[PDB]
Ligand binder design. Structure first.
Ligand code: HEC
Ligand code: HEC
Ligand code: HEC
Ligand SMILES: [Cu+2]
Ligand SMILES: [Cu+2]
Ligand SMILES: [Cu+2]
Ligand SMILES: [Cu+2]
Ligand SMILES: [Cu+2]
Ligand SMILES: [Cu+2]
Lengths: 455, 455, 455
């Protein structure tokens, strides 16, 4: 067989697993070992987006699950524990395992129980692992996937940084960014119509202050998984190129590409060399996923500009939208204040401030000034002040035709933004009303609900 | 040109075609020949799933159609007959043919007619063929696709087994597993929302007693097609790796991968070496296809276990669900008994028995015992017996909160299983009621229809 | 860095850009230059299909946008102008650019404004460029994408012809071929449910009299892009093979394949050698895209037939449907006559004539004769003449069972053709009624609207 390096030698190794986006250190070993892997399934509520909760099912408390790193030819003793708070039984199928179900039948584990099985890691490569319990798609859709790396015997080449990024598609009963605890939606899942498509389990998991980091001149290796359950990722780095892309344990290595297709259940190792400073965006280039469903992550590169290579400015909210900022924590706070019944005007203002970026500022500008004759001002806008309800209708339903704002005629078109949720429109408009010498007051989500029900 | 080996020599060969999942023998020939291929289109009703009929349109009576095997440089005289019972005209486009439409204009054949055309097989490779008659998508969706292999002049390397597997997506008016003769649904097809995604034309075509077979140490070559019409397959083998994957006649060969993307209309040759015994599952790893729409096939490997490579057990119904068993023939029989108006309790029981596997047994166990305090028993369940209608509501709509069953408190969550059809819920519950010292009686599909209409 | 060929030398070059499907000449240069690229965004209404208008947003007045061709190591000074008639601001992200956003932040351009930025072309390859303005998906869905080629320093190998083809998916409020100015539909876009999937911006952009051309024995290179926004293309040439397929600037080159997956936002260079005459169809082999949504383009090859390679006939309306003809201009004219209120019978007849090809002629024949006993005649049909309204119901809702037509019994099935729009059914039936000694008269779209509302 392949990976024929003999029986385990040395002492048993207890594998140290890491949480995304980090990776365990290189195994740095020239002999096969017995490696004991202990992974615990935990079901728990986490934020899939700001103010939006979801009951995740996780390997090790995170989505994706703990990263496992071993060497080709190791004997792996795999222990799966199912936390007693779990409602469902769980198990594991590891790609790269030689044997039926990738471990599935022997790792079946009821809540409060533990299972174990052993396998030899014959196949070098990066591999998805995932739950394999009926109904399988639900378990995977709830977050039960991660990566296992089986290193070549000599190790991978040294790089400056290694990161762990995994795409998944998620199916909520509610629409994108609709607040509250969102149940899983089987109808959307069967139809392959996800409400969110995400890197590492949440909107903004890898953006803003949670971005990945490197410096100019450094090499970055990223272990990229696609947990699915359903989507194939047109995986792409904005403004950069991959030096190498290698799928699973494949002999083929592609070089110098920017866009690469990762199958559902697939994994790849990609290598990047940072050449100029700024934010490089990892996306699924099925564009509505990246820009309307959350499928964007950032590798932020620090260092000296090189104007001979690129003269332009850093990425901003025109492209990245409301994820250009460090975080959108004001939205979480406003949502929690609504639930508690303590929503203040300032809670709404700060939430709207976060949501205004990109969404409105692309045309109206970050300072509300617009562009005279082309985009009308929201700053000190007589048209806004004159009719707040008309403003709600404008956001939801658009506006066109000749209007007069602060003494100037506009004759253009603002598209409808009907996908904004009632709280989002309310908070945005409350921000605008309380900025730029506008009259203050507030708009409530209930106000917006009524305007949505009858244009 | 390529395949420039001269005019046909020897005698004309009448091609012997094979039905899936078998393949004709290697051509074992060192000279170009004239090869006469005769293929007949037949439209006919077959079972797409147990108790579910569909009007297939087929090349040679099967889906996929008869496998055609020739040598690069052969001159192929292709005869297409359209059976007189056909309602539609038909034709053929063979990928790998050099010429407009891949044969489409010259192979147009009305019902009861025959056509013929000739082409030189210049391009070595594995290729999809399919109908090319307006409306093309309908013809393909109804099953009109297969594979043609054009061998390299020296032949392919010898292997122990060769098999023929083709994915297709199907569009029925009714939902998945809704019984009866199901018409084609154009609205679902245009939207690329299939009701079934299948290997070789039917649910379970390649599972259970219809599994593919090999022995430990043997090599298996599988000719894999994706007839579409629409889907791209994240093609994957559970618990194994492909030694090689080669697309069509491509010069590139990938090695040591487990997951590979096959385009709509694409074909690949994959090679597997059996290392340990058990069931290896071929899936489309867009998981809801494999586990909710039928996209799973089995290669069952016989031989001695190797505990140093894999210590675990064979695949079971936890992962494979109700396809772990040899067949689900009881469902076909119960469905036919309903149509005839002769449905007995025992017909329902045996049908429910088949459907209970995986679907319910993952939590409640194959013996109905559950797990005390975690999953409540269905065996001798006082809670079940106390209210049969409540049991129908539980399957359809779920259950949560504190309950008492056989003197023990449970405080967990059973998800809804709303996608089960009325007959499936009726048969499952009838099985349960007539097992494990439960009180007997029956539930009817009409009972379930009423509970579905008002929770 | 890569592309380290020194500072620009010689004189500044003003790039000459080309409109699809043409490509600028090879740069034919052995030194790095400064290349000044000037591109103007124009928003405008164009025909997405005959009688169907759409407001496209374009780079340079076309979809896809102007082709840009430079050499690896060039310094590119990129000027983006936004025409003053524009309603939206725009910018550009060029794949292959080294730097954040691929130019996005520095190329933000309000209506009536100009922006510029500079970059060094370090990466050789074919690359998509596209708008990068919030909401990004809308901008791209409206047509804002094209290709930039960065040649290797020695140039690409000489070929006889070079062409430029780009797929995109489009989202209209109305259904496929529903006439009028069609707004963009955000709901369909987010769900990845396009109404049209097109090469180069329109149905028939590259079919009939707008086909690409070459001669037997010549080599054709095609720069193929997938602008998306959302779909992955199972890109395929009917009846031919690609000698080479190279993605972006990748080191891997695949050879001798017919079907290849192009990611959303991906681009490839493919090479074809014409071997026999006829029409070769480029499609997205997700078949319902190619045959029901418009994703088909033609490379028409002139030259001597070779019966030893292919004995069959040229592609016709059986496969290609109504795109077999030179154009469908009669449909545009009938649609415009309806809007103006001047629709004549002959306008309808000529429009129906175009629409009858494939759609009806596959069974009923181009001369309406049918096939006695199998497909009934529309020529001098007593059954048609006897009840025009029944004919509308037949097209919309199908027909089966025993009928008598011109003294002969038929007992077959004509499927419903419910996806035909009211004007299409009206025009088809008006064509039939005014042909083949049928009684004349006309059917109106309003007639058909009433039959659709109640079968
Ligand atoms: C460009 C693509 C825009 C985006 C994004 C948003 N708005 Fe807009 N807005 C835009 C135009 C071209 C116009 C004038 C339309 C016309 O008929 O000429 C408007 C108008 C408004 C108004 C009314 C006018 C004013 O007071 O200046 C309001 C209150 C407004 N827009 C608000 C608004 C908000 C809150 C947005 C984000 C949610 C937003 N707009 C986005 C162009 C564009
Ligand atoms: C785990 C994922 C389950 C699957 C699959 C099925 N059931 Fe279940 N069931 C489950 C739990 C955790 C509970 C208790 C819920 C609570 O509120 O604590 C139940 C309960 C039932 C009952 C009622 C209790 C009893 O009699 O034991 C019935 C009748 C029942 N379940 C039936 C049932 C059937 C027929 C299933 C397959 C279709 C099935 N369940 C699946 C957990 C799970
Ligand atoms: C084959 C796939 C067909 C296509 C495409 C179209 N028609 Fe058809 N038609 C077909 C059959 C097999 C039948 C007879 C059905 C039966 O019950 O046996 C018909 C019938 C008609 C009729 C009525 C009979 C007649 O006058 O000949 C009409 C008026 C008719 N069909 C029209 C029609 C048109 C306009 C079509 C294109 C839009 C068309 N048919 C497509 C088979 C097929
Ligand atoms: Cu699980
Ligand atoms: Cu898997
Ligand atoms: Cu056919
Ligand atoms: Cu094809
Ligand atoms: Cu734009
Ligand atoms: Cu891009």
């Amino acid at each position: 067989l392949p990976g024929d390096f003999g029986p385990p030698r040395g002492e048993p190794i207890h594998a140290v697993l890491t949480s995304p986006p980090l990776v365990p250190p290189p195994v740095n070993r020239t002999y096969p070992a017995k490696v004991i892997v202990e992974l615990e399934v935990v079901e728990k509520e986490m934020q899939i987006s700001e103010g939006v909760s979801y009951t995740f099912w996780t390997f090790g408390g995170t989505v994706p699950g703990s990263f496992i790193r071993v060497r080709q030819g190791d004997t792996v003793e795999f222990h799966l524990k199912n936390h007693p708070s779990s409602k469902a039984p769980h198990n594991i199928d590891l790609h790269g395992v030689t044997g039926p179900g990738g471990g599935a039948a022997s790792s079946f584990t009821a809540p409060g129980h533990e299972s174990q099985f052993t396998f030899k890691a014959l196949n070098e490569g990066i591999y998805v692992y995932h739950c394999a319990t009926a109904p399988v798609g639900m378990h995977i859709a709830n977050g039960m996937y991660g990566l296992i790396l089986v290193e070549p015997p000599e190790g991978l080449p040294k790089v400056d940084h290694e990161y762990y990024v995994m795409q998944g598609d998620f199916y909520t009963a509610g629409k994108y960014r609709e607040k509250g605890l969102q149940p899983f939606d089987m109808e959307k899942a069967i139809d392959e119509r996800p409400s969110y498509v995400l890197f590492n389990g949440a909107e903004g998991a890898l953006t803003g202050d949670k971005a990945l980091h490197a410096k100019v001149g450094e090499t970055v290796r990223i272990f990229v998984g696609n947990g699915g359950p359903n989507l194939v990722s047109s995986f792409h780095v904005i403004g950069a190129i991959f030096d190498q892309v290698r799928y699973e344990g494949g002999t083929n290595v592609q070089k110098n590409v920017q866009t690469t297709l990762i199958p559902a259940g697939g994994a790849a190792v990609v290598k990047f060399t940072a050449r100029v400073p700024g934010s490089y965006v990892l996306v699924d280039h099925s564009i509505f996923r990246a820009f309307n469903k959350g499928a964007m992550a950032i590798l932020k590169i620090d260092g000296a500009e090189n104007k001979l290579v690129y003269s332009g400015k850093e990425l901003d909210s025109v492209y990245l939208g409301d994820r250009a900022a460090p975080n959108m924590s004001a939205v979480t706070k406003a949502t929690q204040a609504s639930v508690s019944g303590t929503l203040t005007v300032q809670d709404q203002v700060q939430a709207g401030r976060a949501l205004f970026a990109g969404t409105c500022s692309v045309c109206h500008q970050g300072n509300g000034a617009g562009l005279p004759g082309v985009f009308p001002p929201l700053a000190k806008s007589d048209f806004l002040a004159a009719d707040p309800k008309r403003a709600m209708n404008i956001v939801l339903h658009g506006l066109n035709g000749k209007i007069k704002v602060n003494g100037q005629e506009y004759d253009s078109v603002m598209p409808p933004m009907t996908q904004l949720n009632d709280d989002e429109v309310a908070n945005i408009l409350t921000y605008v009303l309380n900025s730029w010498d506008n009259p203050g007051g507030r708009v409530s989500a209930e106000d917006v609900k009524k305007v949505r029900a009858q244009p």
